[PDB]
Design a protein around this ligand. Structure first.
Ligand SMILES: N[C@@H](CCC(=O)N[C@@H](CSSC[C@H](NC(=O)CC[C@H](N)C(=O)O)C(=O)NCC(=O)O)C(=O)NCC(=O)O)C(=O)O
Ligand SMILES: N[C@@H](CCC(=O)N[C@@H](CSSC[C@H](NC(=O)CC[C@H](N)C(=O)O)C(=O)NCC(=O)O)C(=O)NCC(=O)O)C(=O)O
Ligand SMILES: N[C@@H](CCC(=O)N[C@@H](CSSC[C@H](NC(=O)CC[C@H](N)C(=O)O)C(=O)NCC(=O)O)C(=O)NCC(=O)O)C(=O)O
Ligand SMILES: N[C@@H](CCC(=O)N[C@@H](CSSC[C@H](NC(=O)CC[C@H](N)C(=O)O)C(=O)NCC(=O)O)C(=O)NCC(=O)O)C(=O)O
Lengths: 201, 201, 197, 197
């Protein structure tokens, strides 16, 4: 019953694919442009499906059409208990995801200006996450890194996906941030996540 | 106990100011640069307050420091019952807010390219909201326009603030969208919102 | 007879108005939305005037329509001898103006009081122009050769634009501040600036 | 002896490589990160070579360092007579290249298969260049005068870049498609293209 529609790219779909992998949820991963014309296939999709904003990702669960990648993430995270276990932890997971969006946007919008990115913004943002993880030190041992409380949240997956994307371009980016480094390794090594990354294009 | 910190601008704070107005919540509206050097005042702020990402808005409630405008909105909307009354309506309010962010971003990032904005993106996005409101037609009379369910949500305020900002620059923007037009008028005329807009710089 | 058409703003028209000031050329400064707005006026403009890209600035000289601010700037500079007096200096003038468009764009899109702009981009680009000025002498203050180029008026416009938002931006850049002062006091530009709104 | 330094990409180097092809000038095409990467190499470059803005492309001729792609393009075009043979044609060539940078930027930042780009910007700008071509004759295919300018090679580069992502972009623009074909078949460019990766 579940179909995720996106272009043939990680981008705005990949966090949702990571959540379904973590959760072991079966779905069809529909990708426009894998073979044919992405724009033609997308245009033909918009004809057949009622989308609210003529954008993807779209997640269809039975007859229910959901749009807006962040809103899908939040909905799924709430339904499947990866959103934090207190009103404050839920807020913190959301705050951290929102910060991931700021720096992921900068990464995505270059990086033609890469020295400023490489020397100023990326280190600075990395330090912000390093400090957030330090604050949660505190639930551990064991091991257990999480951004928020004592259990995985979508904020863990989002920060993983951010630095997974960054490391593809800039391999040494986590050398100066050992907590953030340990976090990324911890997440990448979760059975369902490791499995998914192995299978992935 | 509540202080909102931002620059002397509407921008990323204004939806939070609209929510506190709607809710009748007392707070201090702290604005950097009202008199002095905004950057100096902001730099001095970051020295005195522990911010997660060295950005504003920051909302301080007692000793609790909250960052990330969307996350603050969502937290406040949940605590004060303006987030929708079903798991699906909560998702829809979030989806609509996320769409508002897409078009508000386009508006904010010009609009040096204004004919494409004016003739393509803005009408198209306006039509998306017009259609969402049509879908909710349906809870009414009475009157009651809402995007989501039978009661106000932050999505109503966000869409109001989006078109309030747009109308300042482009007064006739809602002429072809009468539902969206009726919605904006309905929100602007809510006692606490009308009051706030009257008082506003 | 010469008409410059733009919106009511400095923007992509300002350097052209500065060259007209410097050279003491008389022209009509048509600004949309006085008047106003804007808009509408601009949509009427496009129906009346045959622009190549439906953009402004437009510089009309008699019947002749010129578009593209940087092309307009180059054309005026070559005609009125503020483009360098060697092939190499004409290139350096050009190169320098292309550098200006680089940080000017960052300044225009760095909103607002972005720390990275103030602590990384702005200091770095300021260092570039300081270094370029240093290379051509502590004054012989000219970026290129030993007379004014449109590159001087471009760097002046840049830091003037910046300064309005970030006072004391030229503090750690002695040749650059001195260049900025030199240019602002040339009588024609001094006058243009006092009378500008 | 001539070395063009850039990253391993078309980007802001491509039009320069196209002019070198067209004029049959021999040069070394140094691309960072073959090799590789990237990076590192580029940080080493900047320590070794005295660049004015710590950016590439850099074109070195003997000892002489040239930066800023558009300044490099103009300088080559003026030296090798592909910049127009009148003051007005030199301006139109320039104006047209400035128009190219406008939609090229939109194409480069419109990610990806943006509908507004395909239904609004691209058709509109294509209309502009069609109109410009029409104005200069159905071939006399040249944007400016009656010989090749760097403006022809700029419009060729643009639509070539586009075409790789959006096949059939030139369908409703007969002079523009014919111009694109004319240019792609000039022997020097035909050859450059087959051998390009
Ligand atoms: N990280 C990815 C790349 C980024 C990416 O996903 N790019 C997209 C386009 S933007 S993704 C497409 C875009 N969607 C949105 O922008 C959705 C915005 C909303 N706020 C949300 O988060 O859901 C959209 O639908 N726009 C349609 C329109 O505007 O007409 C793509 O098509 N890549 C494939 C390729 O190039 O082959 C990767 O490295 O693989
Ligand atoms: N709509 C507003 C204008 C937009 C605006 O708010 N601009 C801000 C700057 S961006 S707002 C300042 C920015 N914050 C953010 O970008 C927060 C991003 C996060 N994703 C969130 O949503 O909270 C920030 O803190 N950055 C600091 C840094 O980067 O160093 C401003 O300073 N205006 C006042 C003026 O010009 O006088 C208006 O019309 O009045
Ligand atoms: N930085 C300036 C502001 C920038 C500015 O000039 N803003 C313009 C918008 S872009 S200026 C208008 C724009 N032109 C261009 O973008 C010209 C680009 C070309 N490549 C060139 O360089 O000439 C244009 O014609 N648009 C095409 C379209 O609308 O379809 C404006 O209207 N300002 C007043 C206001 O806010 O009301 C300042 O300090 O005031
Ligand atoms: N559209 C192209 C890609 C664009 C491109 O060339 N990308 C570059 C980045 S910008 S090219 C590198 C950039 N130069 C510039 O931005 C030069 C701007 C100047 N105004 C001019 O025009 O010359 C620069 O030097 N940067 C300054 C810094 O890093 O600090 C690159 O490295 N690509 C390969 C890759 O992805 O690895 C394509 O089709 O391949």
């Amino acid at each position: 019953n579940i179909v995720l529609y996106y272009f043939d790219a990680r981008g705005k779909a990949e966090l949702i694919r990571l959540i379904f992998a973590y959760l072991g949820i079966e779905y069809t991963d529909k990708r426009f442009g894998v073979n044919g014309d992405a724009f033609v296939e997308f245009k033909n999709f918009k004809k057949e499906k009622d989308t609210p904003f003529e954008q993807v990702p779209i997640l269809q669960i039975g007859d229910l059409i959901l749009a807006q990648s962040q809103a899908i993430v939040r909905y799924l995270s709430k339904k499947y208990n990866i959103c934090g276990e207190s009103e404050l932890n839920e807020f913190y997971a959301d705050m951290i995801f929102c910060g991931v969006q700021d720096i992921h946007y900068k990464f995505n919008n270059t990086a033609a200006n890469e020295t400023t990115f490489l020397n100023e913004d990326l280190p600075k943002w990395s330090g912000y996450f390093e400090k957030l993880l330090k604050k949660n030190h505190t639930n551990n041992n064991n091991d257990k890194y999480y951004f928020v409380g004592n259990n995985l949240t979508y904020a863990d997956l989002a920060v993983f996906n951010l630095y997974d994307d960054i490391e593809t371009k800039y391999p040494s980016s986590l050398k100066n941030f050992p907590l953030l480094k340990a976090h990324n390794e911890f997440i990448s090594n979760l059975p369902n996540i490791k499995n998914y990354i192995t299978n992935r294009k």
